[PDB]
Nucleic acid binder design. Structure first.
Ligand code: ZN
Length: 462
RNA sequence: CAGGUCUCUCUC
RNA sequence: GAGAGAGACC
């Protein structure tokens, strides 16, 4: 992805868009009970903690574009995936606006505590002023659909979150590109059924993990991905996507029966306009971080990518022997013979993709179930029932989260969440965590899940 | 101060 | 089943 141009808002007649500049995050009552290296991300250009120009680092992610049109490997890759999707019988028909706004069994309603985006978030209009969960009123939506229309600018803010320190000195905070409610609604109308199917079907048919439940999904992965594992990390996946991958996506959506009107919407996320503060810019390539279908579209593109890489990198690759699961840029995959990702990464490079060894390994080693991660969690066979697989969030990550809070009113829920994550690491580790929590006054005030009960509840999920 | 998923907590 | 919160992940 590449920034094409940057004009003042005056020249473009776009409204200014300013986000918060002070972090909501404060050290929690556990900040000095647990070790951690992470601090709230740099939000503002005159942060004492900085060591580079802020805005420079912000948009460094857009590393450029290599390919703009699918070659033969990508075309063949697109087709193999779309064929695999055909057995899902995705409803290519347009979802109703009442449904697209207020949700279904398999697609959550549009979030209403959240910004309506351009231009409403500059005209003091909330989504609570356009939508009513209780009415399912869609009439006022229709109206604004027509006033402001489609293909509105995204609204660029900086993400409020913990970051490792190098990323704080080096200023590489992340960006939130807020879609307009208009585009969200229309995108949900166009692909809502696709969202539904994907959510209802995490696994190796969609090749997506969106909608999985890691407590239970983790036991199926060694069966869904038989054979030899491979894995790797991207840098700036979303931003690094060149327009070819959206061309590629278009092929898949077409092959599974989408009308050319529908397919025509992909160009609208490949080529986007963004307002950040007092300026307007253009991005060609790159997945807009906050458009409808980000996770699903990134997951599909990843499925196109992994196939293209294999058959352009190796001889006699049988794509049918490929199993993979993706959640955005995160991938786990298997093949009947080992795959050397050093070679995939070299091919990746030609495609504008920067692929590094899995989990910040210095070099591409072998990936096995004993060191694989997916969604940050490991794989750990239960000691009693070796076929039940524990997802293992690393305690290190769990301690990074507990040392901060955005509202200490909600400490209870926060610590309870972390325990649901921590117990999988085993009894010993968990009781170490709990008693560290208890080691502090409000820690003795919290209701903490019993390890035995967590386990018992887990076993009963099966 | 985006898009989502999952899980939990609270209430009718 | 519906409203209200939170947390993690992508
Ligand atoms: Zn443009």
């Amino acid at each position: 992805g590449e920034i094409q141009w940057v004009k003042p808002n005056k020249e473009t007649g776009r409204l200014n868009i300013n986000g918060p500049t002070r972090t909501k995050l404060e050290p929690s009552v556990f900040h000095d009970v647990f070790e951690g290296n992470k601090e709230p991300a740099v939000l503002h250009s005159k942060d004492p903690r900085l060591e580079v120009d802020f805005e420079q680092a912000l948009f460094s992610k857009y590393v450029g574009n290599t390919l703009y049109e699918p070659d033969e490997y990508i075309k063949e890759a697109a087709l193999h995936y779309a064929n695999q999707l055909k057995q899902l019988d995705i409803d290519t028909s347009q979802m109703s606006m009442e449904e697209a706004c207020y949700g279904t069994e398999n697609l959550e309603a549009i979030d209403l505590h959240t910004s309506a985006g351009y231009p409403y978030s500059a005209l003091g209009i909330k989504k609570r002023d356009i939508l009513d969960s209780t009415t399912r009123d869609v009439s006022k939506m229709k109206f604004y659909m027509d006033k402001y229309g489609l293909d509105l600018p995204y609204s660029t803010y900086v993400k409020d979150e913990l970051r490792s320190i190098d990323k704080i000195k080096k200023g590489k905070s992340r960006l939130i590109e807020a879609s307009s409610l208009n585009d969200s609604v229309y995108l949900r109308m166009t692909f809502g059924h696709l969202y539904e199917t994907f959510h209802a079907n995490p696994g190796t048919v969609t090749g997506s993990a969106v909608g999985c439940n890691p407590d239970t999904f983790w036991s199926k992965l060694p069966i869904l991905l038989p054979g030899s594992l491979f894995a790797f990390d991207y840098s700036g996946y979303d931003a690094s996507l060149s327009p070819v991958w959206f061309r590629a996506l278009e092929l898949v959506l077409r092959e599974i029966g989408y009308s050319e009107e529908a397919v025509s919407l992909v160009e609208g996320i490949n080529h986007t306009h963004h307002v950040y503060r007092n300026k307007t810019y253009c991005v060609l390539g790159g997945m807009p971080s906050g458009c409808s279908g980000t996770s699903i579209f990134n997951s599909m593109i990843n499925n196109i990518i992994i196939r293209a890489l294999l058959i352009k990198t190796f001889k006699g690759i049988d794509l049918d022997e490929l199993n993979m699961v993706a959640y955005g840029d995160d991938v786990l995959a298997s093949y009947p013979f080992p795959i050397d990702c050093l070679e995939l990464a070299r091919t990746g490079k030609e495609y504008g993709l920067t692929m590094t060894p899995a989990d910040k390994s210095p070099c591409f080693n072998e990936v096995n179930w004993d060191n694989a991660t997916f969604l940050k969690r490991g794989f750990l066979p239960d000691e009693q029932f070796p076929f039940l697989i524990h997802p293992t969030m690393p305690m290190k990550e769990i301690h990074e989260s507990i040392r901060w809070t955005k509202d200490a009113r909600n400490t209870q829920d926060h610590v309870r969440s972390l325990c649901l994550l921590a117990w999988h690491n085993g009894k010993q580790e968990y009781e170490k965590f709990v008693s560290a929590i208890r080691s502090v006054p409000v820690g003795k005030a919290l209701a903490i899940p019993n390890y035995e009960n967590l386990r018992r509840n887990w076993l009963e999920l099966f």
